[PDB]
Amino acid sequence: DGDTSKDDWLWYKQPASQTDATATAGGNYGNPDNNRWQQTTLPFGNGKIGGTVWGEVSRERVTFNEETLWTGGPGSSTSYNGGNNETKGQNGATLRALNKQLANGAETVNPGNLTGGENAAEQGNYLNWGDIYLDYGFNDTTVTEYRRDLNLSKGKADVTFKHDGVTYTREYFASNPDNVMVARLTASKAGKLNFNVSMPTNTNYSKTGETTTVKGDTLTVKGALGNNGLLYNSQIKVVLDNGTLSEGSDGASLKVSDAKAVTLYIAAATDYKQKYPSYRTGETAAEVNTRVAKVVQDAANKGYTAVKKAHIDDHSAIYDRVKIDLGQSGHSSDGAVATDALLKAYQRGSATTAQKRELETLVYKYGRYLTIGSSRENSQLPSNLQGIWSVTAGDNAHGNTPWGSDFHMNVNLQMNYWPTYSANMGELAEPLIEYVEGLVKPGRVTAKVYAGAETTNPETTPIGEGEGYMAHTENTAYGWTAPGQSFSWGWSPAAVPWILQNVYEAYEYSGDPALLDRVYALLKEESHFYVNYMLHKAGSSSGDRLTTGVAYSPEQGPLGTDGNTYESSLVWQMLNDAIEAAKAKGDPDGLVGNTTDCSADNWAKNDSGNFTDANANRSWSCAKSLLKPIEVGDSGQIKEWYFEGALGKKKDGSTISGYQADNQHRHMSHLLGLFPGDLITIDNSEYMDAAKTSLRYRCFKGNVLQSNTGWAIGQRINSWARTGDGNTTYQLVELQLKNAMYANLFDYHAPFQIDGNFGNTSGVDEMLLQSNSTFTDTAGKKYVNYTNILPALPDAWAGGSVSGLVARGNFTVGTTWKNGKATEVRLTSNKGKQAAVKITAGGAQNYEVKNVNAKVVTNADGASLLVFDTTAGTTYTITKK
Numbered sequence: 042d043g044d045t046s047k048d049d050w051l052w053y054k055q056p057a058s059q060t061d062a063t064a065t066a067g068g069n070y071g072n073p074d075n076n077r078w079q080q081t082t083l084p085f086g087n088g089k090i091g092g093t094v095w096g097e098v099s100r101e102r103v104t105f106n107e108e109t110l111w112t113g114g115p116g117s118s119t120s121y122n123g124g125n126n127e128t129k130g131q132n133g134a135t136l137r138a139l140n141k142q143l144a145n146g147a148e149t150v151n152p153g154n155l156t157g158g159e160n161a162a163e164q165g166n167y168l169n170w171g172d173i174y175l176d177y178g179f180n181d182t183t184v185t186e187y188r189r190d191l192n193l194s195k196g197k198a199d200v201t202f203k204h205d206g207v208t209y210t211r212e213y214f215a216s217n218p219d220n221v222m223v224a225r226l227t228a229s230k231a232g233k234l235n236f237n238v239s240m241p242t243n244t245n246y247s248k249t250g251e252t253t254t255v256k257g258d259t260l261t262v263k264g265a266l267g268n269n270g271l272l273y274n275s276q277i278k279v280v281l282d283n284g285t286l287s288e289g290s291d292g293a294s295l296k297v298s299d300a301k302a303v304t305l306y307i308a309a310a311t312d313y314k315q316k317y318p319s320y321r322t323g324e325t326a327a328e329v330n331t332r333v334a335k336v337v338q339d340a341a342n343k344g345y346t347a348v349k350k351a352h353i354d355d356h357s358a359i360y361d362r363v364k365i366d367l368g369q370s371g372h373s374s375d376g377a378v379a380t381d382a383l384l385k386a387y388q389r390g391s392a393t394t395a396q397k398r399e400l401e402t403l404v405y406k407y408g409r410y411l412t413i414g415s416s417r418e419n420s421q422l423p424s425n426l427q428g429i430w431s432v433t434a435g436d437n438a439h440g441n442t443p444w445g446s447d448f449h450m451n452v453n454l455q456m457n458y459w460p461t462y463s464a465n466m467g468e469l470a471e472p473l474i475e476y477v478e479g480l481v482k483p484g485r486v487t488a489k490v491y492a493g494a495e496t497t498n499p500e501t502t503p504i505g506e507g508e509g510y511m512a513h514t515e516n517t518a519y520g521w522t523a524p525g526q527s528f529s530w531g532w533s534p535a536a537v538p539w540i541l542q543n544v545y546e547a548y549e550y551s552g553d554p555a556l557l558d559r560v561y562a563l564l565k566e567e568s569h570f571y572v573n574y575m576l577h578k579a580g581s582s583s584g585d586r587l588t589t590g591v592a593y594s595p596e597q598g599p600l601g602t603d604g605n606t607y608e609s610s611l612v613w614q615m616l617n618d619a620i621e622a623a624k625a626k627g628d629p630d631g632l633v634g635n636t637t638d639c640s641a642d643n644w645a646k647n648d649s650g651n652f653t654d655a656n657a658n659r660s661w662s663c664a665k666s667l668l669k670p671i672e673v674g675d676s677g678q679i680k681e682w683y684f685e686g687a688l689g690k691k692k693d694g695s696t697i698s699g700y701q702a703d704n705q706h707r708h709m710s711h712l713l714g715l716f717p718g719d720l721i722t723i724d725n726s727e728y729m730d731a732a733k734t735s736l737r738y739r740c741f742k743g744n745v746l747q748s749n750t751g752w753a754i755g756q757r758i759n760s761w762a763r764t765g766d767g768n769t770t771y772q773l774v775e776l777q778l779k780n781a782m783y784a785n786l787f788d789y790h791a792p793f794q795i796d797g798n799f800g801n802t803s804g805v806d807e808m809l810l811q812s813n814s815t816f817t818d819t820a821g822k823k824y825v826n827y828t829n830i831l832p833a834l835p836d837a838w839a840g841g842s843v844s845g846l847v848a849r850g851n852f853t854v855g856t857t858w859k860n861g862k863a864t865e866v867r868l869t870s871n872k873g874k875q876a877a878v879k880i881t882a883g884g885a886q887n888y889e890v891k892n893v894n895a896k897v898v899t900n901a902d903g904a905s906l907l908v909f910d911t912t913a914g915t916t917y918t919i920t921k922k
């Protein structure tokens with residue numbers, strides 16, 4: 042390992058079984074062992090397989106996952122159709138009738154028939170694969186010199202202790218380049234390494250024809266999921282250093298005896314494929330077997346040293362892109378404390394400043410680490426509710442695993458990909474882009490059933506050229522794009538618009554023309570879908586505007602209103618982004634249009650759902666201009682519903698049915714225009730005071746800050762950051778670390794939900810750098826996606842530095858500050874785009890740039906930007922005059 046004193050570690054002086062697991066367990070974790078798993082174990086992965094290390098003395102345990110072990114989908118029934126219910130949808134007639142009731146003046150309608158997804162065996166869920174047990178068979182677990190750690194920098198978990206005079210060590214990592222999990226096990230005296238290795242599958246999912254067999258140095262477990270026939274195969278190849286290897290007496294394990302060091306190569310795979318409609322590779326069980334055996338064989342052929350080197354090089358190339366120094370201590374500090382002890386001191390308010398900055402920076406860093414472990418460029422699937430890490434397993438949705446550890450697209454999956462670009466991991470978004478592309482074919486079925494949008498030739502019609510694809514909140518590995526069996530969580534077609542922000546951002550941050558074309562195709566077809574099938578002139582309940590028709594605001598208030606701020610803000614952003622994408626391509630399709638002869642009356646349709654006037658302006662620019670997503674209510678708040686009066690009330694003073702009466706609703710579905718969107722910004726700030734008001738009510742009772750789920754706090758951190766109020770933002774960071782982090786630094790809802798880990802990383806980035814807003818100088822000139830240095834810097838962080846953050850337009854950003862003001866900015870232009878740099882903590886007019894002909898422009902607020910041409914590859918240093 043060499044010098045690891047500068048590496049980032051989570052570290053513990055005792056095994057998981059002796060680590061504090063006393064925080065709220067949450068749903069599905071009533072079993073003490075499962076609860077211990079989520080609070081205390083340490084995760085690693087290669088985007089595809091993953092482990093969670095217990096670090097037990099005698100019976101060591103690594104809980105094992107592979108990303109595609111999903112029940113549900115084709116083969117789970119003889120009629121799997123993505124959950125779509127034709128009798129419910131009626132080819133769009135059910136929705137059309139409901140929207141007509143709204144347009145005619147209803148405030149609410151009963152959307153109870155807009156459901157699908159009734160068979161929980163078809164929906165399925167993500168499964169814990171099983172565990173690897175390394176049973177040392179010690180007579181007692183008495184040890185000294187015990188440490189377990191996770192080295193975030195090298196992308197490995199370590200265990201060491203001394204037992205009866207002998208030092209045992211363990212090291213675990215999962216290589217992306219060699220697609221293999223590695224366990225390096227050592228004893229300090231020859232002959233003293235003795236253990237049994239087995240890999241039991243989780244006992245709670247049904248199985249068909251599973252066998253566990255040993256041939257030579259290799260243990261193989263293989264079967265088919267009883268729920269859907271999915272083939273699975275895992276293998277452990279045990280390579281003794283140049284000791285004894287025997288078949289375990291149970292015939293289901295391997296026995297290493299009288300050894301000193303061994304390397305285990307672990308691989309696993311299924312025959313899953315993200316390929317509609319079959320979702321299989323077509324391999325036979327023998328083929329998957331051969332494939333998996335070759336993985337471990339190729340790895341062994343390369344050998345431990347070379348595999349480990351290629352892994353650390355691969356991991357660290359991404360992990361080391363970003364450095365942050367807020368004055369933290371670390372594991373090699375005098376008086377360094379273990380991570381569980383750090384957490385406890387932080388929660389009790391006894392942590393020193395250096396210790397507070399250690400936990401804060403470790404949590405930040407862990408969100409980046411966790412992206413690398415769960416979401417690689419070659420992962421078949423994006424990160425799910427738990428990344429890739431789980432201990433729970435059952436056959437059916439809404440079963441033994443909370444929310445199926447699924448792809449949840451009414452905030453959670455989005456939050457997973459909030460830090461991915463700004464924290465310099467842009468390539469790791471690729472599985473999300475492919476996933477969303479993967480929704481187009483099944484979602485055209487949903488679009489046709491529920492909105493009457495039928496794409497002909499749905500198999501050969503390219504993305505961008507269809508009539509629309511529709512998906513809702515709960516999604517899976519298998520194009521489960523139907524609405525849920527209950528509307529009040531299940532129906533949410535704006536999920537697609539919203540996840541298309543995360544996708545569009547891949548181009549916004551890179552300027553890559555291959556991405557431009559991919560994101561343009563998606564936006565074009567989803568915009569067409571909404572303009573042609575979803576939008577209508579509102580009824581009297583929602584005033585004068587286009588709305589999206591029957592809607593629910595996740596996840597509170599009335600069912601089936603005439604649009605809402607959530608859906609309008611989202612559709613506005615989508616049309617915004619679609620227009621930007623079209624412009625960048627020279628508008629080849631002529632879809633941008635204009636606001637000429639533009640009216641909500643342009644959307645009039647006949648009884649059969651076709652536009653009355655074929656020639657009327659329904660262009661993207663027109664539609665966008667008619668949404669008017671934002672209104673301020675009687676309490677000075679952003680309204681969540683257009684019939685809103687005061688906060689939580691209707692115009693006539695009556696409460697809004699189902700509004701969460703304390704004001705602490707976890708979702709803030711009506712503030713998406715502030716974060717992640719570009720609708721309410723520090724520049725376009727007509728509604729910033731109302732946004733802040735709304736935020737205060739959502740987080741505070743008087744002057745007392747309220748707690749919430751980890752993800753709800755993660756959204757609040759990001760939203761406060763966009764306001765510029767760095768002090769309040771930081772109160773939320775602190776609240777998250779005190780109330781929503783287990784001892785292993787897993788974010789919790791409860792239970793463990795990874796969303797809030799990625800929300801934390803994003804929220805910190807947004808404190809130090811923003812790049813989403815548009816500046817308008819006093820001459821009227823526009824600077825779109827300008828680089829905003831230290832926009833929400835808390836007084837708690839008076840000095841520090843960060844390097845390697847990414848701004849839209851593709852600029853890498855480093856900044857150092859002291860006494861609350863930037864002392865240096867380093868701006869690397871990766872694409873040659875003109876720079877426009879605001880310095881919120883210091884004022885850009887007070888700085889000069891070197892490599893430079895930089896002009897200062899000012900807005901009516903008195904805010905200044907530095908503006909200068911750049912060359913791709915060049916870094917510009919900005920310092921105070």
Ligand SMILES: C[C@@H]1NC[C@@H](O)[C@H](O)[C@@H]1O
Nearest residue numbers: 444449453596707750752
């Ligand atoms: C996964 C679940 N999705 C819906 C949300 O309201 C819950 O709080 C969880 O995040």
Ligand SMILES: [Ca+2]
Nearest residue numbers: 108415420422
């Ligand atoms: Ca994955």
Ligand SMILES: [Ca+2]
Nearest residue numbers: 549718719813
């Ligand atoms: Ca944007």
